[PDB]
Structures are given as C-alpha cells and as structure tokens.
Write an enzyme that holds these catalytic residues in place. Structure first.
Site, PDB file in Angstrom:
ATOM      1  N   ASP A 158       0.700  -1.150   0.243  1.00 11.29           N
ATOM      2  CA  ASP A 158       0.133   0.162  -0.260  1.00 11.29           C
ATOM      3  C   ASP A 158       1.058   1.152   0.241  1.00 11.29           C
ATOM      4  O   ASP A 158       1.551   2.121   1.148  1.00 11.29           O
ATOM      5  CB  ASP A 158      -1.333   0.242   1.802  1.00 11.29           C
ATOM      6  CG  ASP A 158      -2.184   0.839   1.124  1.00 11.29           C
ATOM      7  OD1 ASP A 158      -1.407   1.752   0.490  1.00 11.29           O
ATOM      8  OD2 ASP A 158      -2.568   1.583   2.369  1.00 11.29           O
ATOM      9  N   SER A 172      -1.010  15.450 -11.424  1.00  8.31           N
ATOM     10  CA  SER A 172      -1.123  15.296 -12.759  1.00  8.31           C
ATOM     11  C   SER A 172      -1.004  16.792 -13.583  1.00  8.31           C
ATOM     12  O   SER A 172      -2.345  17.520 -13.531  1.00  8.31           O
ATOM     13  CB  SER A 172      -2.571  14.480 -12.918  1.00  8.31           C
ATOM     14  OG  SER A 172      -2.480  14.732 -13.734  1.00  8.31           O
TER      15      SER A 172
END
Ligand SMILES: NCc1ccc(C(F)(F)F)cc1
EC number: 3.4.23.22
Length: 330
Positions: free
Chosen positions: A35, A199
């Site tokens: 994770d 992004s």
C-alpha cells in the site's frame, strides 16, 4: 541489494493486489496488500480475535526464533474507506522476493474491521508511503522500504500492476524491459506523508486534452481512480445511460456499454487508461447496472490515483533525497 516479487489481483475485478512476504524464522509466508497510501506493515496473527479471522494466513510470533516483542508498543489505523485494525508490535526478519530487512516492525493485529475479515485473500498490509504516517505508539516505526533504502542498488521501488493479470513489485532497480518509451518524472510533496503529485490534466477517450492541475496521491492500496467532480462528470457524460446513483454510492453505467479510455497527464507525458479498466462489474449479483472505476473525490478531501490509474503505467516511487514519481506507458 534488490528485491523482486510477483503481485496478483485478489479477484476478477482487480479489487486489490497481493504479494508474498516472508516473515520470521523459519519463514512464514503471508500475502500482503502493498500500500503506497499507508505506512504500517500489519498482519493477521495468532492474537487476532477468533471471530474476526476467516480464512486468512496468520503470523505466529511465538513460532519465530527472531521475533521480539516491542515493549509497550501499540498501533491503530483507520483507512479512508472506514476500515481499521489495531494491535501490538514485534520486530522480526521480513523478506520480499530476495530482499531482506532484519528488525522490521511487524504490526500484529488483535482486532480487524469487517472488510478485512471479509477479504480472505488479504493477510495484512505492507505500507510504502512515508514513515511519518506510521501509527506505532509511543515510538513511531519505519516502513520496509525505509529500512531497506540504504542497502538498495538505487533508492527506488517500482509498481507494475497487471490488468486481470500478474504483475511485479521491484525494490532497488528499474526494469527497462517493463515499459515503452521513457519514464517521466514529476515532483512529490511529502507534507501529508503520501506520494503526492500534480497531474497536468486529462482527456476523455479521443477528446481534447484539458490542461488543469490535479493534485493527488499515487495509491496502490486504493482500487479506483478518485478525481474532482467536474472531471468525473465530464467522463461519465460520454457513457450513454451513466448516472450518479446515491443508493449505490457513485457513478453506475449499463453493463452493455463500451467505456471510453481516460488519459491523465504526467508533465508533457500522457498515460492512457483503457476503457475496460474502468469497468467494475455488476453493482449486485445478476444486475445489468455496472459500477464505475472513476469516482468523485468530493467527499474524500484529496484526489486518489488508485489501481485503476496506476495499473495503466510502470510506476517508479523514487526515494532519493528529494523523492519524485516516475510514470511510463507499458
Ligand atoms: N487503502 C488501504 C486498504 C486496503 C484494503 C482494504 C480492504 F478492502 F481489504 F478492507 C481496506 C483499506
């Protein structure tokens, strides 16, 4: 040194990925969920409440000759999905595909929430986010990547998750045969303890690339792609019959649809998520309504580039002095 292990989807939907981990002496292999959104290495164990164990493989510290109880240490974690686990701590030898760490904190569960009990394929988690998020009290512990980093040939780990297929987690090296083109690196903020990046935008199918800053985290421990509502509405608007369902808890679409792809920007580079990756099957057994893989992050507080997005790319988690994230098409 290096480590290389195969990661496998737990089911036909790629709801999560498991990777074999050897703990203790002699080795006790547990299939853990690696994770990048958390920093606790926790496992189902001989101490877990009997009714809360349903088919998972347990860690028995009394059977490990190298297991040592970490005095007065306890841990407790609550994940974004409302799931949780807690227990005590041991230090023990942990290996992942040939890479070994001695004295790694292995968080032994005394209790786990219903969703962990329900996933019989997940034996616990192996946190790969920054060690600042580790929950061990009163003395915080380091992640497996943090403990191994100095010994690695290169202070990095890569995630190469498969779509309905096996994949790979490598430590200490970059497999240049595992991707096409170049790896584009982008800046990371460690302020919230996550592999947080920005992004450069998105496109829906063959549509125009929308240039816009989307701050989010690279999270292998989250199944879906969680993005701003404006972005998610633009995507599902391209799917005939798609709607946001309050009863289901997100966007659903007719199972007979052919979903358009979703592209996210990494600097001037683009990662294309094929439409098939966004299909998470019937909302309930036998239903002709399917659940979407792109959901709104409005009630979360942060955007999450989960497995839907990460499995479309070869992802480098660069643990250099200034950590960065690398993404390449594959
Ligand atoms: N994001 C961490 C995480 C991973 C798996 C699970 C589940 F589904 F196994 F409960 C919950 C939370």
């Amino acid at each position: 040194s290096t480590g290389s292990a195969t990661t496998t989807p737990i089911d036909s939907l790629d709801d999560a990925y498991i990777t074999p981990v050897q703990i203790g002496t002699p080795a006790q292999t547990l299939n853990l969920d690696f994770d990048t959104g958390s920093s606790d290495l926790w496992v189902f164990s001989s101490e877990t409440t009997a009714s809360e164990v349903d088919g998972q493989t347990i860690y028995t510290p009394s059977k490990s000759t190298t297991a040592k109880l970490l005095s007065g240490a306890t841990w407790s974690i609550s994940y974004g999905d409302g799931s949780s686990s807690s227990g005590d701590v041991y230090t023990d030898t942990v290996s992942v595909g040939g890479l070994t760490v001695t004295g790694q904190a292995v968080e032994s569960a005394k209790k786990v929430s219903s969703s962990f009990t329900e996933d019989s394929t997940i034996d616990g988690l192996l946190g790969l986010a920054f060690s600042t998020l580790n929950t061990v009290s009163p003395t915080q512990q380091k992640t497996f990547f943090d403990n191994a980093k100095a010994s690695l040939d290169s202070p990095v780990f890569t995630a190469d998750l498969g779509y309905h297929a096996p994949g790979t987690y490598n430590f200490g090296f970059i497999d240049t045969t595992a991707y096409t083109g170049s790896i584009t690196y982008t800046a990371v903020s460690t302020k919230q303890g996550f592999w947080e990046w920005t992004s450069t935008g998105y496109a829906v199918g063959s549509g125009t690339f929308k240039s816009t800053s989307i701050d989010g985290i690279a999270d292998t421990g989250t199944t879906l792609l969680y993005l701003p509502a404006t972005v998610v509405s633009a995507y599902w608007a391209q799917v005939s019959g798609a709607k946001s369902s309050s009863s289901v808890g997100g966007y659903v679409f007719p199972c007979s649809a052919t979903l358009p792809s979703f592209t996210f920007g990494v600097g001037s580079a683009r990662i294309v998520i094929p439409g098939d990756y966004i299909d998470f099957g019937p909302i309930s057994t036998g239903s002709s309504s399917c659940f979407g893989g792109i959901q709104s992050s409005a009630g979360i507080g942060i955007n999450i580039f989960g497995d839907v997005a990460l499995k479309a790319a070869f992802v480098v988690f660069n643990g250099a002095t200034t950590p960065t994230l690398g993404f390449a098409s594959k």
